[PDB]
Each structure stands twice: as C-alpha cells, then as structure tokens.
Amino acid sequence: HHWGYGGHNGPEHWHKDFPIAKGERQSPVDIDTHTAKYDPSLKPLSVSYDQATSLRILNNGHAFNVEFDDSQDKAVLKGGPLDGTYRLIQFHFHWGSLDGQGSEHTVDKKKYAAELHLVHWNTKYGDFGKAVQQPDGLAVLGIFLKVGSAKPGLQKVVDVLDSIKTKGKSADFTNFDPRGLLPESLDYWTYPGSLTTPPLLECVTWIVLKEPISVSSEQVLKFRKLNFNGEGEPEELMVDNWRPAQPLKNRQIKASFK
C-alpha cells in the first residue's frame, strides 16, 4: 500500500489501486437531514462497554488506533439497525488542520472538527478478517467532535500521543473506558456503507450519532502534533486524514428519531 492523505496519494487517487473506491456503497456521505427518513422500526442502540478492555494505542501512519481485546464478548454493540452482536476491536479519529474541517460524514454539508469511529465486527463471522468480506460484517459508530469545552474522558488519549508521535510507534493503553467518549443522546442516522480507508470494503452498517461531543481546542491541537511519517523522516503533520463525502447512489439514510 502507498495511499495516504498527502499531496499526491490522497483520496482522489485511491481508485487506481482500490477500484471499489467508485463503488455503489462508499463512505462517508453527506447526511441530508431533511431527506433522511424517520424509521419507527429502528431500535434503541445498545452500547455495552462496561467490560471493555483496552490494550494498546498505535500510530499506523494514517491515524491512531486504540485497540481492544476482542477475544470475547466484552464491549459489544447491538440493537439499533443491527441483527446480532458486534464486538469492539478499535477506535480512531479523523481530524483537520483547522477546526472547520476534519469530519468524514457531513450534516447538511456541515463539517465538524473531527469524527470518532468505534469499529465493531459481527461475531457470526468469527474474526475481523472474515467479517470485512461480508456486507453485514462491521458496525461503525460514528461520533462528531466540535471544539468548545474539554472532554474529560478524552484527555488520557491526548496525553499519550507524545509517545506515539510517528508511524509504527505503539504504547500500552490499558484501562481506558470508551463510555467517556459517548454524548448524552444515542439518537442516530444509519445507512449501508464502507470502510473509509483502503481497502474501502463495502462491509459496514454505519451508525452516526446526531449529538456531537465537545472537545477543547487544546485537545484537538494535540491530535495535530502527530506525524504521518516514521521516526526521523521529514515531518509531515498528521492532519486532514479524512475522506470527503462520496455519492449516496441507491441508498437511504434512516433516522432513529422523529
């Protein structure tokens, strides 16, 4: 792989190595709130993170992933639009160089400063690598970030970033509680889509919360001190690691709320 978010390998190039980039169910999308249909058949989301076990944080050269122990049903997502049980494997964010961009999904064309993705795989497929080969393999919970008051539950993530500045670095990251990243309301929009990074597999049920979380300017500024490059290489700040909105095509976005 050579893709990225630089001047010559960014989203508009991905289709050359990953032709599904021009597929029928690509993500992210703009959420037209006027057009999304309230679906009284959608259930409340069940986010069950009481037993979550974080293990490690990794700079993978395109974001940082907070990884979980997904060897048992500890931290699982169910309900909502989903049939069955999805196990949390990792979360990560996408963010901008400035507060006016950074999210992947947009809401009536509004871009948020960042977007959190909590990635879960369907236990009926046994492992993540098998799940991504299935149209109902993953459930990603997406949460917008706006800049205002600090998010206290994010600070532990922020403070470890200095230790994983460059691509390939990891650090122990135990005992982190992802419930501290969840807004008050679980109202959501949902639609069928894809991973937003190569290989762009069309395996995701997206669940995008309506209510953003607030983080401070100082918190997001620290995300922007990360590097895409490896240690000692020319510094390239990890900023603008978002894919823009893709064509909705023959898809409906449904709302869980009136």
Residue 211 partner contact from Br ion, Zn ion, none using kind-dependent CB cut-offs of 5 to 8 Å: Br ion
Kindly state whether residue 211 participates in binding Br ion, applying the rule CB under 5 A.
yes
CB of 5 to Zn ion, least distance (A): 12
197 HSE (CA, 13 A, CB side): 17
Tokens at residue 72, please?
């048992």
Give the separation between CA 174 and CA 160, rounded to whole angstroms.
12
Annotation marks residue 120 as catalytic: no
Largest Cα separation within the chain, whole Å, is 54
CB 94, CB 63: distance < 8 Å = yes
105 is in an annotated binding site: no
Q: Does the annotation flag 34 for ligand binding?
A: no
Among residues 78, 117, 120, 167, the one that binds Br ion under rule CB under 5 A: 117
Partner whose footprint covers residue 132, from Br ion, Zn ion, none (CB < 5 to 8 Å by kind): Br ion
Query: Can you read off the two tokens belonging to residue 182?
Result: 């969840």
Q: Please tell me whether residue 12 binds Br ion under the rule CB under 5 A.
A: yes
CA distances 162 to 98, 104, 127, 216, 226, Å, are: 20, 25, 31, 17, 8
- Round to the nearest angstrom and report the end-to-end CA distance of the chain: 43
Interface characters, 221-240, with Br ion (x: CB under 5 A) = -x--x---------------
CB-hemisphere CA count at 13 Å for 76? Answer: 15
Instruction: Please choose which of Br ion, Zn ion, none residue 231 contacts, taking the beta carbon within 5 to 8 angstroms, the exact cut-off set by kind.
Output: none
Q: Which of 117, 169, 210, 243 binds Zn ion (CB under 5 A)?
A: 117
**One symbol per residue from 127 to 166: x for binding Zn ion (CB under 5 A), - otherwise; what is it?**
----------------------------------------
Out of 108, 162, 172, 218, name the contact with Br ion by CB under 5 A.
Answer: 162
* CB burial of residue 20 (10 Å; 0-12, 13-18, 19+): middle
Would you tell me how many other CB atoms lie within 10 Å of the CB of residue 16?
10
Sequence ranges of the binding site: 92, 94, 117, 196-197
Catalytic positions: 62
Sequence ranges of the binding site for Zn(2+): 92, 94, 117
Per CB under 5 A, residues contacting Zn ion are: 117
Per CB under 5 A, residues contacting Br ion are: 11-12, 33, 37, 39, 117, 119, 132, 162, 196, 210-211, 213-214, 222, 225
